[PDB]
Design a protein around this ligand. Structure first.
Ligand SMILES: O=C(O)CNC(=O)C(=O)O
Ligand SMILES: [Mg+2]
Ligand code: NI
Ligand SMILES: [Zn+2]
Length: 331
């Protein structure tokens, strides 16, 4: 069995190996990469996502989200308070202001220590979940707006044609902006490209151990757990590395830098934070190996998780017993 300790693997494809996206995912899996839940892919030196980032300031962040925490430093939830619209140039200036800018630090480990010590005492503003792409149309390799769609994969594997579309999302971050512990919708893969700016630190639980994280979360967030049998689908709970280690939960960590891709694998729980002003692009995708995870994915039916149009068909076809209850949650 490849990668039996479930370590995060880092790949360096050549320009020739970068042509065929599906083939390279399957290669990484042949080497055991999925067992970690997360892999890093450094593009060949010949590749670029676009020519420059000099002209992005007029993108609009229609609903910036202020991330307000509650709890203790290592065990907390966050809620998202909606703020007035601002442009990417306005948000970058805000991120760089004395109130929001990254503090002085020695290295990534010192900054990580400061994040976990101090996150809860501040409310950073995240420009998350913005439909769109920064890949040039002429970039043919690993262009997250040109991937094979999840609806086409379901149709190729299972024969059933379904409605829905699959497009990328932009994330504009600042110091301390946070992504809570989650797996993807329907335990899909995700791919994330960090276009510019400061790093993103990731934490991940191997898929084979995801239920250990769920049991810890039910203990640490006991009211939330009574409210919903899949409350991590709400994407609000944070648990620090120190707390995970104290409770014996297997995990790994890695920092992504500008110019690098990360792939999350089906049922790989992940969480993390941004180091300073940045911009990432991400999208969900599927492969044949996903289908079995989709069939078994938990679902929130309490009403909180509220998701895209295109998840309807995935539930309806892969989980017909759950469909009626889940759809009530959506309505
Ligand atoms: O970058 C973020 O805020 C969150 N990203 C992801 O969870 C992902 O790419 O799967
Ligand atoms: Mg612009
Ligand atoms: Ni994710
Ligand atoms: Zn719920």
């Amino acid at each position: 069995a490849q990668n039996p300790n479930c370590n995060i693997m880092i790949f360096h494809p050549t320009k020739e190996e970068f042509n065929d996206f599906d083939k390279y995912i399957a290669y990484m899996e042949s080497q055991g990469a999925h067992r970690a839940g997360l892999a890093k892919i450094i593009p060949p030196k010949e590749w670029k996502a676009r020519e420059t980032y000099d002209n992005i300031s007029e993108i609009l962040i229609a609903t910036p989200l202020q991330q307000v925490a509650s709890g203790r430093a290592g065990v907390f939830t966050q809620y998202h308070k909606k703020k007035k619209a601002m442009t990417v140039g306005e948000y970058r200036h805000l991120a760089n202001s004395k109130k929001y800018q990254t503090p002085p630090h020695q290295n990534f480990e010192d900054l990580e220590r400061k994040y976990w010590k101090n996150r809860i005492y501040n409310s950073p503003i995240y420009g998350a979940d913005i439909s769109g792409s920064l890949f040039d149309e002429n970039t043919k390799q690993w262009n997250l707006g040109h991937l094979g769609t999840i609806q086409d994969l379901l149709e190729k594997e299972c024969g059933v044609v379904i409605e829905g579309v699959n497009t990328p999302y932009l994330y504009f971050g600042m110091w301390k902006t946070t992504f809570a512990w989650h797996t993807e919708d329907m335990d899909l893969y995700s791919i994330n490209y960090l276009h510019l700016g400061e790093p993103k630190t990731w934490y991940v639980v191997p898929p084979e151990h995801g239920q250990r994280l769920e049991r810890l979360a039910r203990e640490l967030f006991p009211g939330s757990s009574r409210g919903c049998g899949a409350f991590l689908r709400h994407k609000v709970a944070l648990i620090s590395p120190t707390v995970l280690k104290e409770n014996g939960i297997p995990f790994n960590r890695i920092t992504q830098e500008a110019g690098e891709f990360m792939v999350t694998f089906p049922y790989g729980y992940h969480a993390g934070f941004n180091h300073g002003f940045n911009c990432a692009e991400a999208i969900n995708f599927a492969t044949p190996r996903w289908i079995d995870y989709g069939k078994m994915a938990s679902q929130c039916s309490c009403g909180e998780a509220r998701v895209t149009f295109s998840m309807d068909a995935f539930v309806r076809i892969l989980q017909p017993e759950r469909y009626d209850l889940w759809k009530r949650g959506q309505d």
